[PDB]
Amino acid sequence: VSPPPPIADEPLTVNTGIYLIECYSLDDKAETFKVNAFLSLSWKDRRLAFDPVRSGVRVKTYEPEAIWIPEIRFVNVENARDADVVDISVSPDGTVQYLERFSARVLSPLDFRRYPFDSQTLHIYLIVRSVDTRNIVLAVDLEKVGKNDDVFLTGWDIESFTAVVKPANFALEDRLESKLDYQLRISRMYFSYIPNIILPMLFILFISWTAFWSTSYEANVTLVVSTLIAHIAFNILVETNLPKTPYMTYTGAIIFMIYLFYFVAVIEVTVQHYLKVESQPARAASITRASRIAFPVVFLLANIILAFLFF
Amino acid sequence: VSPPPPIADEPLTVNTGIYLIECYSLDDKAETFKVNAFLSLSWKDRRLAFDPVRSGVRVKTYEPEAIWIPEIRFVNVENARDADVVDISVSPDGTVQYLERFSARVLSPLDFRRYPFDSQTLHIYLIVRSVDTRNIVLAVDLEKVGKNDDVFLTGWDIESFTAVVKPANFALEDRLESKLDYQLRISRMYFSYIPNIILPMLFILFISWTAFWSTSYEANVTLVVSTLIAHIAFNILVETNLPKTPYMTYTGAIIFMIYLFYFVAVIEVTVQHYLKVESQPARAASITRASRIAFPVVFLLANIILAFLFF
Amino acid sequence: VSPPPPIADEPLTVNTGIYLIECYSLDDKAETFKVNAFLSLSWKDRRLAFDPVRSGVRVKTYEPEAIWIPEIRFVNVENARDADVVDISVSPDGTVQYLERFSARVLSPLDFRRYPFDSQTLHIYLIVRSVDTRNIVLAVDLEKVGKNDDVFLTGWDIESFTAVVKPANFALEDRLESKLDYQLRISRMYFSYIPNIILPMLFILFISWTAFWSTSYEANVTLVVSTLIAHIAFNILVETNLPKTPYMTYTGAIIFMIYLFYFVAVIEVTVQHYLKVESQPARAASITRASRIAFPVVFLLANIILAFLFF
Amino acid sequence: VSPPPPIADEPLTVNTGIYLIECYSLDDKAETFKVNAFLSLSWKDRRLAFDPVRSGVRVKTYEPEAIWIPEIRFVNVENARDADVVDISVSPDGTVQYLERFSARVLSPLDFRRYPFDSQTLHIYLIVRSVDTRNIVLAVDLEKVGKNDDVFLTGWDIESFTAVVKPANFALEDRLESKLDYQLRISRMYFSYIPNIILPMLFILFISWTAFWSTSYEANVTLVVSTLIAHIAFNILVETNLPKTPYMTYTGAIIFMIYLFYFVAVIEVTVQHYLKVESQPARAASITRASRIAFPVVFLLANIILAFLFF
Amino acid sequence: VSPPPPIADEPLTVNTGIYLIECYSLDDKAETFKVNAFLSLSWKDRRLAFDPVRSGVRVKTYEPEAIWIPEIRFVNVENARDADVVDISVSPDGTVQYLERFSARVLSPLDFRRYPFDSQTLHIYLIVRSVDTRNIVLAVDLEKVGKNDDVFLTGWDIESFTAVVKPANFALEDRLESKLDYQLRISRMYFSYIPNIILPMLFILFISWTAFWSTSYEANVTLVVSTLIAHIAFNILVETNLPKTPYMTYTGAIIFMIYLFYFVAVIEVTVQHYLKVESQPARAASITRASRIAFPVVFLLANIILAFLFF
Ligand SMILES: [Cl-]
Ligand SMILES: [Cl-]
Ligand SMILES: [Cl-]
Ligand SMILES: [Cl-]
Ligand SMILES: [Cl-]
């Protein structure tokens, strides 16, 4: 069960290929996704070569135990992949054609800074560690790389499954390692975003601005504070549908700015009343009348600035 | 062992049959369902044939290790199915009758656009990959296909377990694959829907409309904003019982429209008061009196339109 | 090994018996419960008979491999039971006495229509499939059926562990199946129900009725709407302790009726004010005075009707 | 292998000892705790005795397969313990010294009646079933019983790991069973209890009592009802940190009483206003002035009574 | 196989080294983290030595079964690590160079007292138990200790992976144990902290202080109580992002103090009104005017004190 010796002083290329059968369970929080696929490997072990005339067979089938197979692993997997050998076939030249069906919870990092308009690149990193007797490098057989059309990620759009053909060969713990990058590109499709999240949140915010057409401090306090409780309650409602990140996101910025417009509104309401009370009613009414065009315009600009900064 | 050699240039039919023992744990979010069933396969391996006179037995029982068994897999499963061989029986001609009891978390997509009146078609896809020496196709033995009467999905109605008899044989990674479609049809039975979700939500909304029989801006602000907080609180309460989807659903549309009727009501309340204040009390009262019939009628039409658009 | 041949044309009775060691983890939502128990089986395999004089032994102990054992399974289990053979003992006549300790997540349906006064019957169904050479039927050895006194289900009262002695023998996929019904009876013991759920919910409701001793529309709107938000908030608080079902439950009906009494109260408040406003103050006060006895009495009757309808 | 024969008509004592390596994951809801430990057993199998002169060795090491080992199990475990044999050592007399490292989710019942001042006794029950040929009893070797000092349960204080030396030998399914009680004593250490739970809850309650220094029914209704919503909201906030039990707990009683003080306060507010309105202002003010000392004193007594009843 | 005999009366040093491949899934609540890594061990077994001239090979590769390997375990792991041997290489002197890839859920305690500015030290404890025939001690080969640069913990900053070179050799259950401390240092990086948690919480608090520029008791009660409900609602919103601990944390203290400033504000509001009412309007206005500078300054000091006490 030794590796195949070299003809000359060359490494062994193992011709890889992942075919996605069923991609599912993307955990935006944990930055994981479970995948169920085919892994196809191919190398040349001349020890296993045969004359198809004497053998009377075109292709000899082997058990994993019977022949030498390279130790292929995944870099960013949670635990060991649940792989099951489908077929091992040796052509007369000694070309081994290996196939296995596996399933693994992959760990690719996610970027929600542009949420819900963010797009991702999910990584599946294939490694192989060079042995003492001979060095091993990974190749990409593009014919054996693809994805099933049924493969779905609800709320996403599966764009492309490609692979960086060039391996990232490097040194590790005194041995050569050959790494390959398999990239799954998914772009978000949150259709019900503006009616589920933005629209009711803008309604609750606009309700507060009716305090610029009112003069009752008691009515204005109710308007601005009560809508503020409504805003918070609504955020607890859409808490589920929102990115729980240590960094500021696009949607997250909008929401923040909204809490600020509640604060500024309160200040107005308080000032209008203080001026009214301090017998400066002309200034009081001037402000409430200005706020009527000021608050909507400033909101619109600040939101245009935001969108520009994130995109 | 090796596969059984052909009489002629025909393929080997493996006569499949799934009998649902206990279907359970449907995760509307993950679009999964766990199933516990019997898988029955049958093929003819003439190598295993015998004279029942000399053997002194009518049917010989075998261990999976002892004889060749086809590599049958599921396409849309999360991990490998937890199968346990029940019985392997060979008749004197070499007809193998295999039976196993398995359990697997299946991944069929779900459609909640018509919630809570939606119905589903759960798929269980059976494959087999053709070997180098001989090609393999799947057949459906309808006698060995059914479901237990006890099989329950709480809140659903299990209608039919059928299978597309015709296999979808296709090319994959340079080998013949034979696919079978087993379909489980379930139609929703949400009995407590109108009293758990719709009725209290309509009450909270009607309470707001009492502001059309009021003239106190301070009472109307309390009525329309406070019921709005009640609406949001109620949604957090029924949050559990509602479809968390990236697309707009039926119930989801109703709810949206309700947040809009809160916004429109506030506008009314604000306008009635502004006219009252601007010494146009006739216009103010005309509106509040109109809103009295306007809001209920428009709600009813818009809800009739909705139902028609979704069904 | 082969099954034991019949003396005559009789089936083989396997004398079953489940002894519950530790019953736990009942998931009211999933309708599951995990159980840890002993399964005792006994049959007569005359091939294994011996003369205790020559053998010099009263009982011979065997390994599962060494002797024939019937394929016993559970019908309503999630996955395969984690069983471990305790002891296999053969008496001189050939009577095999098998014992194993297992653990399985059982799937019995639950009925919460009468919550929190509901009682359940948890089912553990034992099957055995008849072989080609001989048919097999299950018997109940009542001596080997019981439960440990320590066995607890927090919030329940474990009443009785009994079994329908008569097996439900039936045809399946062309073979005889012998089914047994093991029934675990548990009756709910929700002691802190009236102070955790009912009492604070009645207080929040009574607070609203103080609007019948008030004449301030502005105070009444606060009373009826604010307590309504308090009711909803309280429901979110007891959300945990309540049955999440597709059907209407007892507690669920009470709660519904309460949302209706909020609606009716609002109507009153609105009417009293409209009459007061429309210079019909005599009618206005007549209603508020009537509501004072009307609301409590109607509540009491409607609640008496409810209890009668559910019990 | 067979069990060791007796010298005389005596049973075999298996000298047990559990050493807690890492105790963790206590699920107050499920009444479970996961433990990682050493199990040390010792018995005398004279068949394995040797003369250390001829053998030239002091202690012979054996594989579990090679020698007879007693079937030791846990009573209250969820599934079978994940045990791994560390060492098996036989002294010249035939004294087997077995050691294994295991991990199991134990199921001990919990008592939260005195929460957050409750203390628990976690049980680990060791059994062994007597064989047909000889009976087996369990002994405690106190030298081999202890716990690591690092062993932590966050929010608890691990007091003592002791064992009831005397086994509870009993009859089960016609065989002798020998049970041992290993007790882990943990006393609660909820430090941030009064500032996380009690203090903000008393503040929200006191705010309501400011209604005794007010005469505005409209202000009092806001005070007593709004603080009531604040109380409910706060309970939803500390919902996580509170015992979800079918029985009444200490903290649970305090909370209940608080909902009652809200009810009584509302009654006051309503009565004071009704008397004021019914031109009995002297009685109205007498009550509000009394409530000022009445509510705090009654709260303090009722809370003293409570604490006395639970402790 | 047996362990390697000593040259003299010296123990066997096993030269350890952990290289972190992918560190992930840190459960702040459970105080656990899952890690996927390489474990490299090396010792000298002279029985395995060879002359590379006669063997004609530089390094001989072995199967775990073929040669003796030390029983290395982890102390603070939940269950047994999912290890898979990568390579076993023996140099001519008998130096075994072992490598395995493992994955384990580690259990290190966490300190959130300084949250969200807290830093942690995650522990991975390696043990080996001395055998009867020879004692074993662990050494650290610093060359074989490191971490991949891709290794991420979202919201944290992975600072250093080091190891206490000196083993903590001790007596346990009458045998020598050799323990090693591998330390992973992570410092928190909560970027969106002040806008996600602090800023909206300060806004809700400031809104309450506008009651010092108001004289309407009815407006002040709404201001202070309503913002109090907003505070509680906001805490339920950031409940997810906050440390659930039995001890007081930094952020936890800030929040507490905020509930106290709500209480103090209510007292003010109530006092100002009582003095106004008791015909002492000069004192009433003096207080409200003082509170205007008093509340902000006292808040700032108390927060400066806090920060100093925690840091
Ligand atoms: Cl892997
Ligand atoms: Cl499968
Ligand atoms: Cl089973
Ligand atoms: Cl066990
Ligand atoms: Cl370990």
Chain E neighbors of A252, CB-CB under 8 A = 192, 196
Give B252→chain C minimum CA distance, Å: 18
Same domain, B137 and B111: yes
Put simply, the answer to whether D173 touches C230 (Cβ < 8 Å) is no
Ligand in closest contact with the CA of E22: 1
Tell me which residue of C102, C77, C95, C72 sits closest to C179, measured CA to CA: C72
| 8 A C-beta contact, residue B104 and residue B81 | yes
Our separate counts of H helices and E strands in chain B read 5, 12
Residue type, B151: V
Distance of alpha carbon E105 from alpha carbon E37, whole angstroms: 12
| Cα E240 to averaged position of ligand 1 atoms, centre (Å) | 33
Chain D neighbors of C22, CB-CB under 8 A = 75-77, 107
Put simply, the answer to whether C189 touches D246 (Cβ < 8 Å) is yes
Q: What total number of domains does chain B contain?
A: 2
In order, the DSSP letters of chain D are -PPPPPSSS-PEEEEE-EEEEEEEEEETTTTEEEEEEEEEEEEE-GGG---HHHH--S-EE--TTTS----EEESSBSS----EEEEEEE-TT-EEEEEEEEEEEEE-----TTTTS-EEEEEEEEEEB--SS--EEEEE-GGG-EE-SS---TTEEEEEEEEEEEEEEEEETTEEEEEEEEEEEEEE--TTHIIIIIHHHHHHHHHHGGGGS---HHHHHHHHHHHHHHHHHHHHHSSTTS---SS--HHHHHHHHHHHHHHHHHHHHHHHHHHHHTT-HHHHHHHHHHHHHHHHHHHHHHHHHHHHHH-
| Cα B83 to averaged position of ligand 3 atoms, centre (Å) | 11
Owner of token pair 């966490």: E110
Distance of alpha carbon B311 from alpha carbon C233, whole angstroms: 34
Tell me which residue of C255, C256, C286 sits closest to C272, measured CA to CA: C286
Distance of alpha carbon C251 from alpha carbon C230, whole angstroms: 18
C-alpha angle B97-B103-B105 in degrees, rounded to nearest 5: 135
Put simply, the answer to whether B25 touches C78 (Cβ < 8 Å) is yes
Distance of alpha carbon D89 from alpha carbon A302, whole angstroms: 77
C-alpha angle D92-D97-D98 in degrees, rounded to nearest 5: 145
Would you give the DSSP letter of residue C51? -
| 8 A C-beta contact, residue D187 and residue D119 | yes
Distance of alpha carbon E79 from alpha carbon A82, whole angstroms: 19
Strand boundaries in B5-129, DSSP class E: 12-16, 18-27, 32-44, 60-61, 72-74, 84-90, 95-107, 119-128
Distance of alpha carbon D83 from alpha carbon D81, whole angstroms: 6
D125-156 b/e (C-beta count within 10 Å ≥ 16 → b): bbbbbbbbeebbbbbbbeebbbbbeebbbebb
Which residues does B251 contact at the CB level (< 8 Å), separation at least 6? B115, B116, B197, B242, B243
**Paired sense of beta strands A32-44 and A95-107, if any:** antiparallel
C-alpha angle D79-D84-D86 in degrees, rounded to nearest 5: 150
Distance of alpha carbon A286 from alpha carbon A272, whole angstroms: 9
Chain C neighbors of D248, CB-CB under 8 A = 191-192, 195-196
Tell me which residue of D5, D14, D227 sits closest to D126, measured CA to CA: D14
Distance of alpha carbon D162 from alpha carbon D146, whole angstroms: 8
Q: Which of C192, C225, C250 is the last residue of a domain?
A: C192
HSE value, Cβ hemisphere, 13 Å, CA-based, for E87: 21
Would you give the DSSP letter of residue A196? I
In order, the DSSP letters of chain E are -PPPPPSSS-PEEEEE-EEEEEEEEEETTTTEEEEEEEEEEEEE-GGG---TTTS--S-EE--TTTS----EEESSBSS----EEEEEEE-TT-EEEEEEEEEEEEE-----TTTTS-EEEEEEEEEEB--SS--EEEEE-GGG-EE-SS---TTEEEEEEEEEEEEEEEEETTEEEEEEEEEEEEEE--TTHIIIIIHHHHHHHHHHGGGGS---HHHHHHHHHHHHHHHHHHHHHSSTTS---SS--HHHHHHHHHHHHHHHHHHHHHHHHHHHHTT-HHHHHHHHHHHHHHHHHHHHHHHHHHHHHH-
Neighbours of D175 (CB within 10 A): 16
Distance of alpha carbon C252 from alpha carbon B196, whole angstroms: 8
CA C190 from chain centre, in angstroms, equals 14
**Paired sense of beta strands D95-107 and D84-90, if any:** antiparallel
Cα torsion B246, B249, B253, B256: sign: negative
Tell me which residue of C238, C272, C240, C267 sits closest to C255, measured CA to CA: C238
| Cα A107 to averaged position of ligand 1 atoms, centre (Å) | 12
Structure token pair of residue C303:
């609640």
C-alpha angle D45-D46-D52 in degrees, rounded to nearest 5: 115
Closest residue in C to B189 (Cα–Cα): C246
Tell me which residue of E102, E51, E103, E43 sits closest to E67, measured CA to CA: E43
| 8 A C-beta contact, residue E232 and residue D230 | yes
Q: How far is CA B205 from CA B271, B293, C256, E7, in A?
A: 20, 15, 16, 89
CA E229 from chain centre, in angstroms, equals 33
Chain A neighbors of E77, CB-CB under 8 A = none
CATH code (residue C212): 1.20.58.390
Give C106→chain B minimum CA distance, Å: 11
Same domain, C60 and C174: yes
| Cα B179 to averaged position of ligand 2 atoms, centre (Å) | 13
| 8 A C-beta contact, residue A295 and residue A209 | yes
| 8 A C-beta contact, residue D48 and residue D67 | yes
Structure token pair of residue B167:
């296999």
Total residues belonging to chain A: 311
Distance of alpha carbon D64 from alpha carbon E77, whole angstroms: 24
| 8 A C-beta contact, residue A230 and residue B229 | yes
Neighbours of C121 (CB within 10 A): 16
Same domain, D92 and D57: yes
The CA R_g of chain D, rounded to the nearest whole Å, is: 31
Closest residue in E to D157 (Cα–Cα): E246
Neighbours of A229 (CB within 10 A): 27
Distance of alpha carbon E113 from alpha carbon E248, whole angstroms: 6
Given resolution (angstroms): 3.0
Same domain, C56 and C71: yes
Structure token pair of residue B303:
């809800």
CB pairs C-D closer than 8 Å: 132
Same domain, D178 and D202: no
Neighbours of A131 (CB within 10 A): 19
Ligand in closest contact with the CA of A101: 2
Give A224→chain E minimum CA distance, Å: 10
Same domain, A150 and A4: yes
Minimal Cβ distance to C192: which of D2, D247, D259: D247
| Cα A97 to averaged position of ligand 2 atoms, centre (Å) | 22
In a mutagenesis test of the A interface, which of E203, E205, E231 is the best target, namely the one with the most A β-carbons within 10 Å? E203
| 8 A C-beta contact, residue D131 and residue D3 | yes
Residue type, B208: S
Strand boundaries in C28-155, DSSP class E: 32-44, 60-61, 72-74, 84-90, 95-107, 119-128, 136-140, 146-147
In a mutagenesis test of the C interface, which of D81, D82, D232 is the best target, namely the one with the most C β-carbons within 10 Å? D232
Give C39→chain B minimum CA distance, Å: 19
Chain C neighbors of D80, CB-CB under 8 A = 82, 84, 103
Distance of alpha carbon B222 from alpha carbon C219, whole angstroms: 10
Tell me which residue of A301, A243, A302, A295 sits closest to A267, measured CA to CA: A295
| Cα C1 to averaged position of ligand 2 atoms, centre (Å) | 30
If phi over 0 gives left and psi between -120 and 50 gives alpha, with beta otherwise, what is residue D31?
left
Structure token pair of residue B148:
């237990």
Cα torsion B73, B77, B80, B86: sign: negative
Owner of token pair 């398999």: A182
| Cα C103 to averaged position of ligand 3 atoms, centre (Å) | 10
Q: Is A101 helix (H, G, I), strand (E, B) or coil?
A: strand
| Cα D183 to averaged position of ligand 4 atoms, centre (Å) | 17
| 8 A C-beta contact, residue A173 and residue A195 | no
Which residues does B187 contact at the CB level (< 8 Å), separation at least 6? B119, B120, B156, B157, B159
Structure token pair of residue A138:
């990974």
Minimal Cβ distance to B22: which of C75, C239, C259: C75
Structure token pair of residue C246:
């597709």
| Cα A128 to averaged position of ligand 1 atoms, centre (Å) | 10
Put simply, the answer to whether E24 touches A78 (Cβ < 8 Å) is yes
Question: What is the layout of strands, in order, in the sheet containing B18-27?
Answer: B60-61, B84-90, B95-107, B32-44, B18-27, B146-147
Give C241→chain D minimum CA distance, Å: 8
In order, the DSSP letters of C100-132 are EEEEEEEE-----TTTTS-EEEEEEEEEEB--S
Distance of alpha carbon E105 from alpha carbon A78, whole angstroms: 11
Domain span at residue C301? 193-311
Structure token pair of residue A293:
């065009």
Chain C neighbors of D177, CB-CB under 8 A = none
Neighbours of A52 (CB within 10 A): 12
Residue E255: phi, psi to the nearest 5? Answer: -55, -50
Ligand in closest contact with the CA of D71: 4
Q: How far is CA B255 from CA B261, B310, E257, in A?
A: 10, 14, 39
Distance of alpha carbon B121 from alpha carbon B140, whole angstroms: 19
Closest residue in A to B228 (Cα–Cα): A230
Give B135→chain C minimum CA distance, Å: 28
| 8 A C-beta contact, residue A261 and residue A205 | yes
Residue type, B214: S
Distance of alpha carbon D151 from alpha carbon D184, whole angstroms: 12
Which residues does D233 contact at the CB level (< 8 Å), separation at least 6? C233, E229, E232, E233, E236
| Neighbouring subunits of C (3+ Cβ pairs under 8 A) | B, D
Residue type, A151: V
Cα torsion D240, D241, D243, D249: sign: negative
Same domain, D212 and D139: no
Q: How far is CA E230 from CA B10, C302, E233, E269, in A?
A: 75, 36, 5, 18
Which residues does A34 contact at the CB level (< 8 Å), separation at least 6? A23, A24, A25, A103, A104, A105, A106, B78
Distance of alpha carbon E29 from alpha carbon E32, whole angstroms: 8
- Give me the torsion for CA of C24, C25, C28, C32, rounded to 10°: -90
Tell me which residue of B104, B184, B196 sits closest to B152, measured CA to CA: B184
Chain B neighbors of A86, CB-CB under 8 A = 71, 129
Say whether the peptide bond before residue C116 is cis (omega within 30 degrees of 0).
yes
Same domain, B11 and B55: yes
Distance of alpha carbon A58 from alpha carbon A297, whole angstroms: 77
Structure token pair of residue C116:
């929190």
Say whether the peptide bond before residue A116 is cis (omega within 30 degrees of 0).
yes
The helix (run of H) or strand (run of E) holding residue C188 is: strand C175-188
Structure token pair of residue E59:
């390094």
Structure token pair of residue C201:
């919910």
Same domain, C181 and C240: no
Q: How far is CA D75 from CA C37, D43, D106, in A?
A: 10, 21, 9
B97-129 b/e (C-beta count within 10 Å ≥ 16 → b): bbbbbbbbbbbbebebeebbebebbbbbbbbbb
| 8 A C-beta contact, residue E45 and residue E4 | yes
Chain A neighbors of B31, CB-CB under 8 A = 24, 154
Q: Which of C149, C167, C192 is the last residue of a domain?
A: C192
The helix (run of H) or strand (run of E) holding residue A22 is: strand A18-27
| 8 A C-beta contact, residue D191 and residue D117 | no
Tell me which residue of C310, C181, C209, C188 sits closest to C265, measured CA to CA: C209
Same domain, B291 and B178: no
Distance of alpha carbon A22 from alpha carbon C273, whole angstroms: 64
Distance of alpha carbon D153 from alpha carbon D185, whole angstroms: 11
Same domain, D293 and D210: yes
Ligand in closest contact with the CA of A107: 1
Same domain, D283 and D159: no
* Bridge partner residues of C39 (DSSP): C18, C100
| 8 A C-beta contact, residue A19 and residue A38 | yes
Minimal Cβ distance to D266: which of C58, C84, C210: C210
The CA R_g of chain C, rounded to the nearest whole Å, is: 31
Which residues does E270 contact at the CB level (< 8 Å), separation at least 6? D210, D213, D214
Ligand in closest contact with the CA of E72: 5
Q: Which of C149, C168, C192 is the last residue of a domain?
A: C192
A102-113 b/e (C-beta count within 10 Å ≥ 16 → b): bbbbbbbebebe
Put simply, the answer to whether E36 touches A77 (Cβ < 8 Å) is yes
Q: Is B35 helix (H, G, I), strand (E, B) or coil?
A: strand
Chain A neighbors of B218, CB-CB under 8 A = 216, 218-219, 222
Residue type, B188: R
C246-280 b/e (C-beta count within 10 Å ≥ 16 → b): bbbbbbbbbbbebbebbbbbbebbbbbbbbbeeee
- Burial bucket for residue C295 (CB in 10 Å: 0-12, 13-18, 19+): buried
Neighbours of E143 (CB within 10 A): 11
Question: What is the layout of strands, in order, in the sheet containing E119-128?
Answer: E72-74, E119-128, E175-188, E156-172
CATH code (residue C131): 2.70.170.10
Chain E neighbors of D238, CB-CB under 8 A = none
Owner of token pair 């190398």: A43
